Design a protein around this nucleic acid. Structure first.
Ligand code: MG
Ligand code: MG
Ligand code: MG
Ligand code: MG
Ligand code: MG
Ligand code: MG
Ligand code: MG
Ligand code: MG
Ligand code: MG
Lengths: 129, 218, 88
RNA sequence: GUAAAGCGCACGCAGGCGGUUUGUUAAGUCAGAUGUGAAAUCCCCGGGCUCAACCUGGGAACUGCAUCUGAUACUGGCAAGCUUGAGUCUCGUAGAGGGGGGUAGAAUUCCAGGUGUAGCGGUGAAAUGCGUAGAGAUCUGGAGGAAUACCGGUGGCGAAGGCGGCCCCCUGGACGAAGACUGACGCUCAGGUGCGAAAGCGUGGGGAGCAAACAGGAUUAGAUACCCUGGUAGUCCACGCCGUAAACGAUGUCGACUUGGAGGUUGUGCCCUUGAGGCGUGGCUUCCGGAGCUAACGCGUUAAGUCGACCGCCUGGGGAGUAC
């Protein structure tokens, strides 16, 4: 049963980009969106929109550069039954910096690079390179 | 959508999920190539051919399928263009260094009949070489005068002449072909979603390309 | 399973009102019916294990509905048990 | 999956994990500060013994614990919900699902009698055996036990083990759909509890066919076998026990994603349904195969692909699943 909605979102994209799917829909939710924003402001995804009135469906338009998709690597990190929390001086660096690591800080869901500068730490979420 | 409106789709329902992006509909158990991208793709590719054709680019037409074979040989002979309508020998491209020697025979042998240097020798002996030339003309014949790999390759159907494309895309030789549903476009770098069958369909573009070729070289 | 009549009948005595059959109390009560009525069928035969499998599923389930009810509202829970005389 | 390794299968306590919205809290989490974390080791920068080892100044570190002040995204607690998870109801559908009790036809064997006469039976041949006390064959009547040809299938149902004639009684689950209702009541599960093929065990029945043991005949060098002639337990039933199997998909359960093809079974919607029908669309199920995965064979939307939750298990062969 669904015990980790975040993982499903990430998986939906990785498997989607693999099949060259135009986009990818799923049951939206606050956190899901907040995370998508970071993905957008980072050029990993084209755009995204959450339809529905009483049943929010988050439409995530995948993105592809040349003869390949943008998101080549994206895996959950701070999964349930084993949560992970790091310090500002202990934030992970995805792909030596070329990649990002979605982190949920007390200020919101931001990229590692950003949070690391905002002088605050938080719970990692995944690594999108 | 001129004469083009005389070919529509092809292949019943076997198709290939890869050609889906180029399909329109499917009536009576048969997909119909979406011209909405068919004709648009037409020029886009055809332009590239003439582009390199201008430098007398070595063009190699491929089409072994009987129903369309004869046509290909004719069109490709409308200029320095080349062709292959008899069982795409394995290696006549990737193994030119070796396959070429075969062409030499076709030559040195032709001269025999071509000139008085043939009447000599018994029937059996002469006969032995006469039969040999026949076969050679089938395969090498339309490539005997191509000392070197082609600047580009153009095959009628992908699946059928699959072997050809494979050797081509390996040598970096731009592959131009017409694929339809059942065909696999992951090979041809210049897709041409069209009916790989129908005598009318083949000649249609066969001459089209040929023309752009002769006119290509200034 | 249970007669359509005995069903609607019990759906009223415990149902939040009527036409509704999702009420926790209802389910619990409904289950107890078959649970008790089946005791007779099982008192005899016995070796009818496959049928028992279904029986237990009802018990174990009712156990959850009841347990759940207690968490969402102790009131209804305590009262419910009284009418059905359960929990030892 | 086949190398060591998925418990034979379920139900389920503890425990682990938890769809979605708002508010609230601030416990985990994060930020800052204050204590404390002996000195010496270590490391950095720099000194002193001719250098070095060695010695030494300052800092970094001591990744920890406590308290104080905040931050509130995420996890947690509380409140109010919500409906897509799960469940209930209604009405339908298919089925060798289970327990009990009847019952039918075919056949085998046995008993009795008629007809009938010298073989039958068996094998590669034989022989044991059965026959003139009349077999076998054939016909008639009777007794009894076990299993249900055809339908039958790539089929169906079940947690697994497993479940086939027909009828009744009692009873479990699954699926579809117009919907109606509940409102996260869920997933997994050590220990625990229950179900467990065949063989085997106890008590009391039953006993036709088949058949461990056993006894003959044969084959063979021998033949404590394979084959033939017989035949006890058992196989059948009731109740209690045993709990194992190559208990096998050799593949734990739950949920979400990822090209396609051909077919089966069952529910349901639309279509002159005027039709066999055609088109959709759920459940379960065969074979083929793409990406991908794999040591390879292969698996491949019913994954061994891509992921998340919980559990079980493996750590070279023999000794040994043996000893205690
Ligand atoms: Mg083995
Ligand atoms: Mg093994
Ligand atoms: Mg198993
Ligand atoms: Mg110290
Ligand atoms: Mg909260
Ligand atoms: Mg037994
Ligand atoms: Mg016994
Ligand atoms: Mg099944
Ligand atoms: Mg396969």
């Amino acid at each position: 049963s669904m015990q980790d909605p975040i993982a499903d979102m990430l998986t939906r994209i990785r498997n989607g980009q693999a099949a060259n799917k135009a986009a990818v829909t799923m049951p939206s939710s606050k956190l899901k969106v907040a995370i998508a924003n970071v993905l957008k402001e980072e050029g990993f995804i084209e755009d995204f929109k959450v339809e529905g009135d009483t049943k929010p469906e988050l439409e995530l338009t995948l993105k592809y550069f040349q003869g390949k998709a943008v998101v080549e690597s994206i895996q959950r990190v701070s999964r349930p039954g084993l949560r992970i929390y790091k310090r500002k001086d202990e934030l992970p660096k995805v792909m030596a910096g070329l990649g990002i690591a979605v982190v949920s800080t007390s200020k919101g869901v931001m990229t590692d690079r950003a949070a690391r500068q905002a002088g605050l730490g938080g719970e990692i979420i995944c690594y999108v390179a | 959508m001129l004469k083009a409106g005389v070919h529509f789709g092809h292949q019943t329902r076997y198709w290939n999920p890869k050609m889906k992006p180029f399909i329109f509909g499917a009536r009576n158990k048969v997909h119909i190539i979406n011209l909405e991208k068919t004709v648009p793709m037409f020029n886009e590719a055809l332009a590239e051919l003439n582009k390199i054709a201008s430098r007398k680019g070595k063009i190699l037409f491929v089409g072994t399928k009987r129903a369309a074979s004869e046509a290909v040989k004719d069109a490709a002979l409308s200029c320095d263009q080349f062709f292959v309508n008899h069982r795409w020998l394995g290696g006549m491209l990737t193994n030119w260094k070796t396959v070429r020697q075969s062409i030499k025979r076709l030559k040195d042998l032709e001269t025999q009949s071509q000139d008085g240097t043939f009447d000599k020798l018994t029937k059996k002996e002469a006969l032995m070489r006469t039969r040999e030339l026949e076969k050679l003309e089938n395969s090498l014949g339309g490539i005997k005068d191509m000392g070197g790999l082609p600047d580009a390759l153009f095959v009628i159907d992908a699946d059928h002449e699959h072997i050809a494309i494979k050797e081509a895309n390996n040598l970096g030789i731009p592959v131009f072909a017409i694929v339809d549903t059942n065909s696999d476009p992951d090979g041809v770098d210049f897709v041409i979603p069209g009916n790989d069958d129908a005598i009318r369909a083949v000649t249609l573009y066969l001459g089209a390309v040929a023309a752009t070729v002769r006119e290509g070289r200034s | 399973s249970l007669s359509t009549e005995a069903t609607a009948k019990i759906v009223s005595e415990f149902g939040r009102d009527a036409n509704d059959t999702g009420s926790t109390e209802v389910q619990v009560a409904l289950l107890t019916a078959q649970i008790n009525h089946l005791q007779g069928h099982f008192a005899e035969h016995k070796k009818d294990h496959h049928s028992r499998r279904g029986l237990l599923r009802m018990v174990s389930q009712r156990r959850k509905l009841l347990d759940y009810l207690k968490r969402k509202d102790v009131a209804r829970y305590t009262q419910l048990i009284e009418r059905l005389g359960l929990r030892r």
